[model samples]
Target: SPNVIYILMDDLGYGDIGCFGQDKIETPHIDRLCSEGIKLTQHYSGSPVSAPARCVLMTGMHSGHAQIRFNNELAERGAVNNYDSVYVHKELEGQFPLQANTMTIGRMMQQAGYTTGCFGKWGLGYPGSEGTPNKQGFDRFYGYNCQRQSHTYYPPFLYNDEERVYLSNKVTDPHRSPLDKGADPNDPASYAKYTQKEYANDLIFDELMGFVDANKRKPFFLMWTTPLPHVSLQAPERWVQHYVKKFGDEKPYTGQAGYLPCRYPHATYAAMISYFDEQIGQLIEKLKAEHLYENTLIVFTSDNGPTFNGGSDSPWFNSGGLFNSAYGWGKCFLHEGGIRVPAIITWPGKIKPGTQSDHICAFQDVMPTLAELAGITCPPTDGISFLPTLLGKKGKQKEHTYLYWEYPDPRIGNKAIRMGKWKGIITDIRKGNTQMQLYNLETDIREEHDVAAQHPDIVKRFERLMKEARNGPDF
Candidate 1:
């Protein structure tokens, strides 16, 4: 088997990187990877948010069947909403935990006789839960054990396996102080409280490199689920300066609607992404330096679309490619801009260079695809292996009849399905609003026009699939 490194980014949109159609952000390293690999054009995420999307990728189950349906903070643990309290209490650290002995992609890769490690955000479960990286079949785990803890890049501590490894960063909560009306929002020094001594990404990157060096002689699987370009507008000073120089000054974001405030909101957002891109460039160089580049397989993708809040200028940067990347259409909704993301795979001498595919697939397909790559039996999954598609063997490649997805909400059912070229969504299905908004994606990738009333036949077929494909949630 070959060494596999899967780089799953957080909240990175379809057009956020250079390989796609991003003009504002510089992702030359990712663009280079696209030039050397195959880009999946019509790929979609399992869900429009963080936890559910990651769960779908981990267990090979669509959101309808996956364990986590939303980004549950598990507020039942007490004081989970409070940043300081949750940081102090281990019980309130993580989101909903996965069931004991639940199968995950990490376990699948381990079953294929390879060392496995997961670096960066692990949102499946809280500390010491069945879903923690260690219990979930990853030999090594580092970085944020909870999603809330990941809100800041300079977290106080990171988990090394099940142990809590404290860092040099102090407990500096961005919400601690309300932005004073008299405070100068344009002053960069006013928002200096967000930056800390030990950045979380730098720590995770070093450990990831160490893991690579430790397992150099044998087959290993690395899952780099970095929480980059996500929110809080925190980034390296140098990269932030780089973008600030490139793009002129702008008004500061004073800890207003969402996460922490930034002096240069647009520049910081672009900087965080470019910083991650720089890390990718460095990782590629390291692989070549260690002679592991040729034998390693690299797959880069985002968990979901670009965020609408936290000072992320999605529309300004054109993060969703052809779709509308505005508020409702971006992060937390059932739209193409929210779920559709960039997917790229590169393996030296295996996949042809400068290739692209428009095969429609979802996160559920990742499990079976990797299993086939290692020539191993895949566990029961709601997906088909796209191995032939990767090798340019379209003659033998199998296509999905339709893709199913559902987001959890009481006010609305929040369900979406894509059949061939047609797309259907029902945001208010639970409140007896069964009416579906249909779109002809063959022409309108933006999903502006609704043709549900015109095509009752397709709507009827979609309604049938909405019931048959899902088992609801027994848990």
Candidate 2:
């Protein structure tokens, strides 16, 4: 059987790569895949933040029903959203407590006779029991459980299935932030640290190659999740300087380094995005070289919207690509900018090439879709599959009756719903954002105009959808 590789990049913008309209940061490798694969312009993620968004991916459910909900311990009564509390305030509340009972895609695939492996970013643990990739069904695991551990690109050590495998040496010299337009990744004086001169994404890709090379003879499922374009933005010298020179903008950021977008602080963030794109290319090359590209199904996407701090998400910058609302909605709200993201599906023979779909679906749909493709009768789940659409055998596309999100925010209460073209979001009046926002995504994909007052019927319908979705029973 063919293999499945799901490549996830943290905090990636909607249009960070060349294929995605990022002229400043060229991504030739990924763009090639987009040329041949399906690029769904209307793809959305489970939520707007990391933990919850990822949780949905693992469980094949929406953010609300998954284990990573709120990025806090399930046992803890009072935990704040990671982004809102960490960057917005400096108080980090929220323990990495992904519950014990939840099932993950890794686990499901493992059970389905595929060797599962996850490299990087686990973040799901609570006091006792196997609460991460191990418990969730991955046979081998490497990298950090929490993203926060990779603070400076190079940490003292990273793990291999809970065992430390490498040691960090020292930080590099001063260089521009690679993810920004004027950053540099390879400066001896840069603060970033890596095992080699290669970009961090490249290093991870090496590990991924090793995994694939080792398991290629058998059916394998690799979750190659990357922590690029996030914090401690750093990229290699070549791409970083290339972008700075190309864009002709070099204003380093000052102030809360972790709380704003653009290369304002530095170019590290932008460089990181481009560098990641290159690594994806490199990995794909390895697959093609191994003659495994045709059968492999490569799913590329982000966890949520463009991050406010360090990351980029401006549609004007081609980040969010006509996203509604402003940059950095704090990742906790249910606004379009927070949750909507870029999703590309590449399956050489199975999925049609150069096809696009506007079907309304989120990360929650991945589980059902993949399970269906793999010929597994997945347990009853909240997600709906688009396998037929992928194969170009579509009649009526799978659509979501309502989409849902939740956070510990006092302002945004707990739910937002999207039905047909209408979307309704609840905001905490105390939080400074208006309450009960409604929009017609078809007419206002950017969502600049909230037609709540004019469309009372739609508002009422969305409100009911949100309520029912929240109160609805398990799948």
Candidate 3:
């Protein structure tokens, strides 16, 4: 069996990288994947948010059937308390957990005789829970167990499976204003407090490399769900300095929207991505040296669209590409900018290089694709295998009839259905008003015009699918 390395980025937009129409960030390694592998232009995430999106990817089911369908973190997990500037949480924290009986991609891969290790964010469950990564079939797990704890890049502690590995970091409140009055925003020293002695990304990457070294001889599955470029805007000074010279000085992001304050927000954000990119390049080099690069399948993608807040200038950067990423279009909304993301797959002799796939695919499709690759039976799922499409067997490829997404948040009632080139969005779904707004994606890729009134037949078809697709959220 081939080694599978799935690198999932957090809050990375559709156009946040060089190959994906991003001119701002220099992502040479990510760009190389596109040039050497296949680029999926019409790929979608499972949901608009983190936990749900990850649940879909893990379970091989859409958000509709998935157990963890929202960003519903467990309330019992106590808040962090800063004792003399050192932050500490009394209990092991986590989010809404997947049930014990749940079948995950990790489980599926392990069943096929692969050594599984997940080295990044594991939001499905906390320590001692039935839904923890170890219980979910991963041999080892390291990184943020709770997504909330991942807000600050310099965290005081991270979970290494069941154990808590404390770091030498002074926990500065992320939402605190940059500085007192009369402070210089341009001065790098103003934000020196945010950068701590032990950076989580650097630590997690080292652990991931160690895992590779330990499991290099056997078939392994590495789920690197890295929490990079998510916000609180912190990165190594070396990379930040490089981008500061390139991007010049920008206004500092004083803690607004409950994220960390940064002196060089733009430069820090860009540096975070480039740093992650460099790490990916290093991983590739290690694979080549270990004789695993030729057989290894490297999959890279984002959970959702670009975030609107946390000092991310989505509009200025045009992070969502064709769709606008201003508040209404990105992140929380059920628009293309919220769910659509850049996806690339690289397998030396398997997936053809320099190819692009427009065949509509979603995160749920990954489970079945890998299942087929590993010669295992796929669990009952809403996804069809896109392996044929990836291997250039177009005649055997199965195209999706329609793709559906519903935001589970009670305050926001949003549902979107993609059928062929037509897109239908129903706002206020929680209310009784289920009118569908239709757009022809073939022409209106931006989804600016709603032609539902003119296209009655298409609207009706979308309405029918949306109703049938979901089993409803498990809230």
Candidate 4:
């Protein structure tokens, strides 16, 4: 009864999948996962950016007070002190790397007698950071952190925990972007030029298969965190073609001038989604063949919302289902597109199929949720378990009602909280200015209407919750 694979795909928009409502590109693998499992429609990531969101995933803490905040800044480089500074003064209370104070899902599973392994993307630990995956939880760790290291698609080297595994001859993977295009992915020279497989997902998938085969006996936890469809648009030829067939070979220009695929072959964008879908299908097959499909707990999600530029199309069409603006932008904000994701929880025979829940939850809750499933008590953490919702229990998490989000206002949007049907948003579009706006999510999912002007009383109440959530030491 050990918990199994937890897969996190980076920068995938909410609407990118077939189940979520991406009419253009089809993601049958993830879609099927949703159909057969519980889909948590109100899931939010820890941060708008990559590293911070991951910090929450691993630590069960918020980026507001977590270490490794805002991607990268060396430990000695000094704490980011700007009131406007995105960095936190302490790396989780001056404890470099990350402290072992709280537990990770990997650690929780390990404590419950499960071997833990993470194959892709370990950004929490810097070169000398203390809480590296090997130290904090996972037995084996691979992939680069901070998202930028993942940008190259084909890196000359990846870290084996703290050690480097170098690829003597460097070559880029053609299966890079989460979008689609008609590029030639069949060139062996183009793909084989690299010392390893070209696709990052393929690399991680192979490593994951090895871990599965090696640890097939006992219960295990394999956290396959992939950087597919994230950034720098790099889809393989075949995957790209799949997207082309779906979204068309024409790209629309948005930012700057003369961008390739900007006006056409946004197919590359759709292709990237298809590529990840195929990888997901393979993982599902692996689980099915192992006969661990029922006993295993597989969680699939992304860090945050979609990226506006660099061919990262919004799941706007997918998750929003006509609720969100089709052309929504800016992840580092409190928009629905940024927070909501397609959360599929699969445990065959245990949970009913075609079950969908609008339970409000965040990524931080994942650690506690996994801990509960592993039959262990979670160490004092910020996120409360959403187990009740998953179990189809009638009671709601009344104690953990409001969900809070804080980020450097992209486009000058502000702090936000969702309490019951009433949601409060505070944003000052002006620099060096502080102002708040409130909205009812039940009526204003698009956030087009701000009723803060009418209800100053509710704003005060939400403000108190926001202050408490954003206060120092708690995150």
Candidate 5:
């Protein structure tokens, strides 16, 4: 069995990297992956948000069937959103927890005799909960246990399995307003607090490679769910300065759109991504030096699309490539801009180099694919293995009849299905509107025109799947 390193980046857009048609951000290392490996052009994520997107990816189930369907803060337990308050009480740290006996890729890989470690955000469960990485079959876990706490890269502490690995970082909320009231936001010194000691981006990667080194002799399944390029723009000053010099100065982000403010929002955003790209380069170099490059399967992808809020100027960056990443399109919405992301897979001799694949696969398919890779029997799942595609067995590959996604969030009741070139969506699902809005993606890639009325047959078919496909969120 080979080593598996799944790098799941948080909130990275389809166009965030250079290989994915991103012109703004420089991702030389990531772009190198596309040229050295297989670039999956039509790959889609499991869900639109963080928790459910991850739940679907780990469980081999789509959002319609996964245990977690939303980014449930579980706020009823008292100030779950308050970053500082939640730090003291580990009990209130995580989102909706995955139940004790539920199946996860971690458990599957562990059972297959792989040394499993999850380094980075583990939003699936809270501390001491049944869904924590340890309980879910990861041998070791590090990084943010709670998603809310993950907002700030400079946090009080990160979890080392169940215990907190306290950092030298000063306790400061990333969401807090920048500077004093009526203070100069343009001043360089005002954004000083955001730059703290012991950055998680650097710390978490250190832990990840250490895990790889520890299990270098064994077949290891490591999930690097890095909380990179997410929100509250924070990155190494070197990278920030690099982008600032290249892109020139832009308007600073002043704590208005929610997350922490930045002196150079555009430059900082680009810097975070470029810095992440640099890490990937280092990771590859480490593997090659360890003589593990040929056998290791490196998978890189995002949890969701580019965000619209905060200092994340998605439009300015053209974050969604050709898709609309407007307020209703990216991140939270069920549109392609929200769920569609860039996926790159590198397996040296096993997978062809400098290749492009339009396999039309989703995040749900990863578990089954990895199961096949590990020669383990896959449990029942909503996924079909894309191993054939990876191995260049085109004739042996399977195509999905359709892909489904649903979000029952109160603010937006949305459901979408992709059937070949046609995309069917139903918004205001909470308002009892069952009519599916259809779009021919081949023609309308932006998904602007609604063709539901023109194609009643397709609409009816989507409606049928919308009802029959869902098992609903099982709490």
Candidate 6:
């Protein structure tokens, strides 16, 4: 029997790994996976943000067809510091709950006789909600339930199932303050308080490894949604020191766009990624120790592209690679840099080593692909299994006619359509700028030139598909 380990990095860009053209961060472990597995060139995420992207990945449905299409938070679950003195109950957390009885990848895997566990951010629902990991077919659940709570790497506590497992770290209100005025920006002492005991990633990693150890005898599904390399800019000191010396001194990021200030923003950001990379190596070593390396399928990807703010130099680091990762193109916007992400799949005896494919697939395709791998029945999905492609059966692999995504936020509402080599995008949908921009990705991967006027027919077709694909219930 085969086990599955899916590593989902939060806000990780397409070009953030060596295998994916990332030069700033050293992700040799992830790069090794790509070398031993299959790298997906034309792979895309569910959405440009966290919640919706995760919805697509779990439900086997695209953003348009998925529930919780937007990043809706639970207003009743007040601020993180608003908790009662002791913070006994879980009221300061949670996201919009998933409707009852909704099927997810965890549920599907559980039904197929696999013990399922999720370690990392579960943004779909908060504690006591129908969408929490445990209620959604996971046998074990750990990490932050509210995405906002995950903003600070050294959170006061993390959720283990329905309980708030508190850590030793004290709340510092990272979003509300900046560094000391006129302070030395290059000095590491300026950003000392941010580091705390019980790093969330380390804590979660321990629990995940424990889960694997306990369930080694049976097939399992482990979703490691490590909240690394995303905001607030905090990493282990040793790793940070290593990169600081490598990149030399730079200006610090004072709580300008939210997140704790960091002395070496570039170096610390790179260090966080490298630390995450080291964890991946440890995970693989654990698999080998448990004698499950050959029988387990490891899939690594990101929820979305690199973020715009929070000390991240996406452009400086070329996080988006060939595509622009500026404000208008990455994270929140509907562009190649926003949704297109790196995907690597490894199964020792199944997928050929050092192979690459340009299969146009999205997060929605994941459920069906996993179902095909596990020899189980998959529900009706807006995705086709790329299992054939993974097995090096190119002739039998089915290609998608078109992939669609639409985010319905009136503030920054945007939609996109990718048909064959052509791509169409519409922004400012809320500001009455309804015109669609078109580009032939084969010729213009950067999406700089707008060819909508040149290809009126193609634009019209995209308009129709956009309306049809996004006809699902609005969030």
lDDT tens readout by residue for model 4, 1-475: 6556888887777776777767877788888888888888878888766777887888787655455445554535543222112112223211235665446777777788999898878766655566677877888777664344565566656666566666542533322322134434333233223223455556667777888878877789888888766665556777666655666545343323212222333666677677777877887787789876777778888887766655454542343443452444345666776666667888887767889888778878888888877787787677878877777773755346677876653355456677887876655534544466776777777777878879989888887887777755322
Q: Could you give me the TM-score of model 6 versus the true structure?
A: 0.97
TM-score: model 1 vs. ground truth = 0.98
TM-score of each: 0.98, 0.85, 0.95, 0.83, 0.98, 0.97
Model 3: per-residue lDDT, tens digit, 357-412?
89999999999999998999898888889889888898998888888887867776
Write candidate 1's Cα lDDT for 1-475 as tens digits.
6899999999999999888898889999999999998999988888999999999999999988888888888787798867778768888788898888888889999988999999999999999677888998799999998888888898888999999998888875655544656777877777776788999999999999899889988999999999897887899889889888999888778767678888888899999988888889999999999999989999999998888887788888999887889987878788999899899999989999999999888899999999999998899999888778888999988888888888875555588889998999988666677789999998888899999999999999999998888875621
Candidates 2 and 3 compared: the better one by TM-score is 3
Model 2: per-residue lDDT, tens digit, 1-475?
4689988887676766666666756667778888889987767777777877887888877766665556553333333333223323212322465566567777778777999988766666521345656777788877665455554465444556755444533332222223334545333343232324324455566677789999978899999878766666556667667767766665554324352223333355666776777778778888889889998998888887775654333444556656642543534566776777777889997788988877777787888887887788886578999877788877856666567776544334445777778777766634555357777888987666878899888877765665556533321
lDDT of each: 0.88, 0.66, 0.85, 0.66, 0.88, 0.86
Please list the residue runs of candidate 2 whose C-alpha ends up more than 4 Å from where it truly belongs after superposition.
73-95, 126-129, 170-202, 259-266, 311-316, 324-330, 410-414, 429-434, 471-475
lDDT against true structure, model 5: 0.88
Model 5 over residues 110-157: C-alpha lDDT tens digits? 899998999989898888888888998789999998888878888899
Ten-residue segment with the worst summed lDDT in candidate 5?
A: 466-475
Candidate 1 lDDT for residue 307: 88
Per-residue alpha-carbon lDDT of candidate 6 for residues 295-328, written as tens digits (9 for 90 to 100): 9999999998888888888999899987899888
Q: For residue 461, give model 3's deviation from the true position in Å.
A: 2.1
Residue 148 CA error for candidate 6 (Å)?
0.8
